[PDB]
Design a protein around this ligand. Structure first.
Ligand SMILES: Nc1ccc(C(=O)N[C@H]2CCC(=O)NC2=O)c(C(F)(F)F)c1
Ligand SMILES: Nc1ccc(C(=O)N[C@H]2CCC(=O)NC2=O)c(C(F)(F)F)c1
Ligand SMILES: [Zn+2]
Ligand SMILES: [Zn+2]
Ligand SMILES: [Zn+2]
Lengths: 87, 104, 104
């Protein structure tokens, strides 16, 4: 019962197990090769990248900030902004 | 400082008994019926009635089997008891918005 | 969106002013008389009238003193003002079911 990852606020499907780092801001971050249901916003930036340039990733449904897209490319999503459950 | 059942006011647990499982006492989870719960983990609880036999199906906590926990007074579903794991062997996952916090 | 007094319609607060105190803006609490309230936390409010002197007895929020907050227009009890803490110094806990949410 922890194989699909959804937005904590609204329950939008974001990523999978399947597609699967503790960091400090200037978070428990989960790295995914693929994701869905996001909206990537703004221009890429390298400022204090934990890894790659980053772009902000919002929930495409409710607009909640769920993490970043890195760009070969991958997603770094904030564990505490996600809800885990079954497929 | 203590948690009561939101429906009837039965004594359930204490803030002192909050337990950080895997870094935090709060876990936001969804069940296979798509219900989302904000679950708080407690080492200890009282005033519940645990129903059925333990099951490991769709357990949100690796290594633990769950049993449904009702309010022993009013029968409202307050969460689950977890067992069969280690460090700790057992704990309770209670639904935050089914509880009411207040003075001892 | 804005929150208005359910009884008379006076403007009280804004969704923009929601404030997560200790993790969430919503707290379900009980007072020493056993009355249960669903409280939403806001950083600011308007149109209220605070009654009495601040008191720290049985505060739901450690480090804050409370005063009762009435609707300044109709006198309906809408919640409490909190003060004397830090980050933030002051905020409001308003009873969600006494408010009506709607467009500005
Ligand atoms: N029909 C249903 C289906 C699933 C569940 C449910 O929550 N299941 C939990 C059990 C505890 C856990 O660790 N993971 C789960 O998925 C419920 C229930 F809410 F009533 F219990 C009713
Ligand atoms: N007899 C009584 C007893 C207590 C209270 C009460 O609300 N107390 C709150 C005040 C706010 C808080 O942070 N904690 C509390 O315990 C009331 C009242 F409803 F009028 F205000 C009448
Ligand atoms: Zn969302
Ligand atoms: Zn009950
Ligand atoms: Zn009013």
């Amino acid at each position: 019962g922890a194989s699909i990852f959804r937005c904590r606020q609204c329950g939008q499907t974001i990523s999978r197990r399947d597609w699967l780092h503790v960091v400090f801001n200037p978070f428990r971050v989960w790295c995914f090769s693929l994701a869905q249901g996001l909206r990537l916003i703004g221009a890429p930036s390298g400022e204090f990248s934990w890894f790659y340039d980053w772009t902000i990733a919002l929930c495409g449904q409710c607009g909640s900030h769920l993490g970043w897209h890195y760009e070969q490319t991958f997603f770094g999503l904030i564990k505490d902004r996600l809800a885990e459950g079954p497929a």
